[PDB]
UniProtKB/Swiss-Prot annotation:
It comes from the Bacteria. Part of a heme-iron acquisition system. Receives heme from the heme-binding protein Rv0203 and transports it into the mycobacterial cell. Contributes to virulence. Could also transport the mycolic acid-containing lipids monomeromycolyl diacylglycerol (MMDAG) and mycolate ester wax (WE) to the bacterial surface. Belongs to the resistance-nodulation-cell division (RND) (TC 2.A.6) family. MmpL subfamily. The lineage of its organism: Bacteria, Bacillati, Actinomycetota, Actinomycetes, Mycobacteriales. The gene is mmpL11. This is Heme uptake protein MmpL11.
Length: 80
């Protein structure tokens, strides 16, 4: 299960204003190689970040680290 963490600089991750960014990142993850399921976003109790977990891994992580930043924009993304 590949992990992707999304951090926002203003407001909580679950804020409605951020949901489309999370939805866009989630949709791009599902397009990654050998990916078949993407979990809905899991929000830290701090609401500082959102965890997206994709069930399927080298080629995937490098693919995500290359493709997801375009989609995330100003938000910070990190692949485990």
């Amino acid at each position: 299960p590949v992990q992707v963490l999304v951090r926002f600089d203003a407001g909580g991750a679950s804020a409605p204003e951020h949901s489309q960014t999370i939805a866009a990142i989630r949709h791009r993850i599902a397009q990654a190689p050998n990916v078949v399921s993407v979990a809905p976003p899991r929000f830290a109790d701090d609401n500082g970040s959102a965890l997206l977990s994709a069930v399927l891994a080298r080629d995937t992580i490098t693919w995500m680290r290359t493709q997801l930043p375009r989609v995330a924009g100003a938000a910070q993304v990190d692949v485990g």
